[PDB]
Design a protein around this nucleic acid. Sequence first.
RNA 1: CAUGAGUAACUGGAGGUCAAGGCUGGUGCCAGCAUCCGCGGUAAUACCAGCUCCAGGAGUGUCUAUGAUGAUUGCUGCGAUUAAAAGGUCCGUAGUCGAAGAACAGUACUUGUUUGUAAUGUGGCUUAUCGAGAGCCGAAUAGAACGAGAAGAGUUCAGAGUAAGGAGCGAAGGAGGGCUAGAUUAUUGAGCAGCGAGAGGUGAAAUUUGAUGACCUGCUUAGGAGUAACAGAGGCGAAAGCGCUAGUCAAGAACGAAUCCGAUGAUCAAGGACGUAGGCUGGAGGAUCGAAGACGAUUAGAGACCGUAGUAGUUCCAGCAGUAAACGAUGCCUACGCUGUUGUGGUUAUGAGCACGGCAGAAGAGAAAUCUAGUAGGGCUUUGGGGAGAGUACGCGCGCAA
RNA 2: UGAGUGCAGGGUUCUAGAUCUGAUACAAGUCGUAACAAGGCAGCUGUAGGAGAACCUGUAGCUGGAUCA
Lengths: 101, 142, 81, 140, 128
Amino acid sequence: TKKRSNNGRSKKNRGHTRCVRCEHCSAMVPNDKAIKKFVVRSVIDAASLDDLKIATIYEEYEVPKSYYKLNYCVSCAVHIKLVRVRSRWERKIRKEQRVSA
Amino acid sequence: ARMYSNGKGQSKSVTPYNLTYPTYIKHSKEEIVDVILNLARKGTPPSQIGNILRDNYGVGKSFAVTKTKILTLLKIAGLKPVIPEDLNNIVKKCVNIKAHLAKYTNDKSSKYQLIQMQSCLYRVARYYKSKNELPAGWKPPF
Amino acid sequence: IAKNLLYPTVEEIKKNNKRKQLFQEVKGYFMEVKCAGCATLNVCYSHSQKTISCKGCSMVILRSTGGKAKISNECSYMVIS
Amino acid sequence: MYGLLAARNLKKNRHKRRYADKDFAKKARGDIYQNAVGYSAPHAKGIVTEKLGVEAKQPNSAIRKCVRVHIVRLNKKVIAYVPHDGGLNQIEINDEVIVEGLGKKGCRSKGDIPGVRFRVCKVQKVSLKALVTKKKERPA
Amino acid sequence: MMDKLANLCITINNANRAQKRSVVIRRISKVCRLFLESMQKHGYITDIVYIDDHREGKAVVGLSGRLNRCGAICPRYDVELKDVERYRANLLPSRGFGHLIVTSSKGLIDHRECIQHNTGGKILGYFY
RNA sequence: CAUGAGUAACUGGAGGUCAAGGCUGGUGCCAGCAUCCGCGGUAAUACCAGCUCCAGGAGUGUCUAUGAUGAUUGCUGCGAUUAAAAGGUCCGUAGUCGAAGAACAGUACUUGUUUGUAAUGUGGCUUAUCGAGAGCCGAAUAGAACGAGAAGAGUUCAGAGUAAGGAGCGAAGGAGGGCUAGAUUAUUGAGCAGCGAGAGGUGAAAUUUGAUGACCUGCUUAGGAGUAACAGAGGCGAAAGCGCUAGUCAAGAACGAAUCCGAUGAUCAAGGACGUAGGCUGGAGGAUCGAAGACGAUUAGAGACCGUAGUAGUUCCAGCAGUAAACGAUGCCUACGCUGUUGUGGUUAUGAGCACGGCAGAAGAGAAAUCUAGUAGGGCUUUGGGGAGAGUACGCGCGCAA
RNA sequence: UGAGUGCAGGGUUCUAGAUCUGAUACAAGUCGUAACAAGGCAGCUGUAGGAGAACCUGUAGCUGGAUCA
Ligand SMILES: [K+]
Ligand SMILES: [K+]
Ligand SMILES: [K+]
Ligand SMILES: [K+]
Ligand SMILES: [K+]
Ligand SMILES: [K+]
Ligand SMILES: [K+]
Ligand SMILES: [K+]
Ligand SMILES: [K+]
Ligand SMILES: [K+]
Ligand SMILES: [K+]
Ligand SMILES: [K+]
Ligand SMILES: [K+]
Ligand SMILES: [K+]
Ligand SMILES: [K+]
Ligand SMILES: [K+]
Ligand SMILES: [K+]
Ligand SMILES: [K+]
Ligand SMILES: [K+]
Ligand SMILES: [K+]
Ligand SMILES: [K+]
Ligand SMILES: [K+]
Ligand SMILES: [K+]
Ligand SMILES: [K+]
Ligand SMILES: [K+]
Ligand SMILES: [K+]
Ligand SMILES: [K+]
Ligand SMILES: [Mg+2]
Ligand SMILES: [Mg+2]
Ligand SMILES: [Mg+2]
Ligand SMILES: [Mg+2]
Ligand SMILES: [Mg+2]
Ligand SMILES: [Mg+2]
Ligand SMILES: [Mg+2]
Ligand SMILES: [Mg+2]
Ligand SMILES: [Mg+2]
Ligand SMILES: [Mg+2]
Ligand SMILES: [Mg+2]
Ligand SMILES: [Mg+2]
Ligand SMILES: [Mg+2]
Ligand SMILES: [Mg+2]
Ligand SMILES: [Mg+2]
Ligand SMILES: [Mg+2]
Ligand SMILES: [Mg+2]
Ligand SMILES: [Zn+2]
Ligand SMILES: [Zn+2]
């Protein structure tokens, strides 16, 4: 029986879409189906900022950040616990997740 | 719906309820009839005659003054073309597509458009050669 | 019958599409425009498909667009039909 | 096909549909005259050539008593079942027996006996029911 | 294009189910007029106005509380006077009430008038 | 009419369907019974018998064809989202189906009168003791002759111009298509320079490569693919499919409006054109990835999964081929239909509309799950009829083969 | 006008045949364990190689998936 109204993907009014590759296992997954995750990570860890304050030559310094978008296939997303199995009424709830660091 | 594609557009223009006589205008009957026959001899299609009469001379639908239709007036004056103007515009588009494909042979989309166009020609031809408006052995310019 | 169904209010008329009514409505009309300066009068159609220039002075009086045509800044008009 | 002047189209279509029915198909397109008892005849005469036994299908547990018959009308050899309690004792090799159908729509196996399609009715011109119950005797 | 007499029937059947009292019907032919005029004679509909719009035509009608259902038959079968009672028993709910309408050389008539005038015709539609 | 007298029932059943016994004795998965479901392994209301009951009765059981059962052949009257079942997409002939207004004609259509039926059958009455039986009466099918009516169907017309179609005009929008000329990085390969011991790969390791200087960091170059992030329940295309920037060449969709022609139209056997990927025939080329083949590990064994390496292919031009879970598993035109919200492109009395969408309820519907599935004798094509064998055999048509 | 009968062929229906190759039933024999749980490498459709055997591997697709995010 049909488990989801949208077939588990975001394609509508189209024939075909570009593929992308999974970060964890390099499998091909369609772009409109892949699980997506955003990361904004400081170059320097929080446990070093108190040393940075005496190491730097400049009057003040702003740490550089690094930015990423990651893609996962279903198997990897479930195994890494980005997503979890949910009850028949919960399946319908849609909410934006946090940006990781 | 549309004949060669999946279209369902609805853009048309409303025909009036009654037609009267355009008393606001600034020419006589005989002047309007002269304007038409001049534009005809210069070689304009009858749909363009209609556009000019509305736009420049200020007459809607070009019949309220004349009690006669544009193509019938051209037959009375003897200015009738050799081929009906619709069938004529279909042969032109075919020629254009064949002239493109002659130099850009690789275009599968243009090939597709040609076979649609050609079908439409024959369907129109069979109408006119039943109403005796074309000779029975007429064939396309190709 | 219902009065609402046989005789709609003028509010209802104005909200509907020109074809989807008990009797279909003409939207295009004719006007007399007068030129700034030379004060000559030209007959024009609303929704014009052609750009039009004033008799005599040759100022462009009316510009054609995708919808209702645009009268040049200084000029003025009256509906005639 | 529902138009008022559509009768010809409708008739040809509906005729072609019927071949999907197994019943109509077999009568039309199968070999309906291959059988000793069937469309051809209600009963068949034949001579006994061997005595035989067969296991019942699961979950039953039995040996069923059967006879090899040469059919006079076709020269095929067929298996038949012998109905009654001591019935096998009433038949000798080279006796003549008359044979009968099991009562299904097509020739089909009945009950727990695998692949046997007929049963014995009379031996040497006399009813097997009378022979077994000792109401009458062999012609001798 | 849809059949005009079919369109008439679905338009009034749905509006009746939705408990509306009046409707506008958008494409009208000669037999559609005569059908509506029949329903008025037997008191199934109350008021009729016709709009002469120069685009086909349209009608505005008031429904009564007595109308349960109506329908057109397609195609329009030819019937002898011997045949009409077969169709009567197939379409109508009771032997006591309701109308089966037939076209004839004497206009539209009901299954009782067929006996009076001694004429078959072509089957058109029904209401009860 | 008159004499004797006192004779005269069987077939199939008794666990359920299905009317009528847990009765007594044998037998112990044996022997048998049972259309179907099922009984019997020592406590059998089902076998073999006794005894009582049941059903029809001068009759009752069995086998075999057929009609019904059966809306499981569907004109009346079934189905095709998931149970069996909508052709991968277009074009198109035969075929079936086709506006409003005003008029006209009678061959179908319906009906009158007259013909057209011995027996059988149908409605009756009369005589054999009764009842079939016999005898007499009346009306009748299809088919044909001559009249009548004109709603529907048909033919014509133009001081008529579809929320039917085609031609054309105006301003604009889009990863729709072909061609020409350019581009920022990245992955490999070579040259040269610096440095002097490990690099790679994994869950953990070994094959493997390095003092002929690896790895990493510079500068030079040579190629062949690709267009990250922006990027979405966004857009375009008949479908398959389409994502860097400029220039160029044809045609199409939608919108605005007092342009022109007038039935030109819907659906479609046969016939024709397109169709991801993998494959095949010839040419160009060859970075990355990698069927086959070869090793290293793991295991009872791995021929596999993992790692090292490696060929055909993967790219382009000219063609052949014709299949996909080619799927929203929902044919194409055309209707009638509740509300709220959010998009994309035009137009706007700024109130709204038109085309193409998404989402959330409701009411109905349905075996439910759910809703492209509500209402319905609108038109046309494809298609299913319990599992298997079988989408297989033989014949035929296309293809170089597959 | 022609019966009969020569000699070649065809069209139909049956039947023989060394040997090979399908299917079905095999109480329970031998070797593994491919599917159904994330079935121990998620499964399935097309196409192409390979292999005691279920099957395995490349390439494009689908969710009837283990994700309506
Ligand atoms: K697809
Ligand atoms: K998803
Ligand atoms: K158009
Ligand atoms: K079409
Ligand atoms: K097309
Ligand atoms: K179309
Ligand atoms: K069984
Ligand atoms: K008895
Ligand atoms: K008994
Ligand atoms: K007992
Ligand atoms: K069946
Ligand atoms: K039917
Ligand atoms: K096909
Ligand atoms: K029109
Ligand atoms: K271009
Ligand atoms: K290809
Ligand atoms: K290998
Ligand atoms: K090994
Ligand atoms: K490998
Ligand atoms: K490699
Ligand atoms: K091709
Ligand atoms: K082809
Ligand atoms: K297929
Ligand atoms: K669309
Ligand atoms: K259904
Ligand atoms: K074959
Ligand atoms: K597997
Ligand atoms: Mg009972
Ligand atoms: Mg019994
Ligand atoms: Mg059924
Ligand atoms: Mg299935
Ligand atoms: Mg199915
Ligand atoms: Mg299908
Ligand atoms: Mg009597
Ligand atoms: Mg008519
Ligand atoms: Mg070096
Ligand atoms: Mg980019
Ligand atoms: Mg267009
Ligand atoms: Mg290739
Ligand atoms: Mg189709
Ligand atoms: Mg079947
Ligand atoms: Mg397994
Ligand atoms: Mg597995
Ligand atoms: Mg499941
Ligand atoms: Zn992965
Ligand atoms: Zn001026």
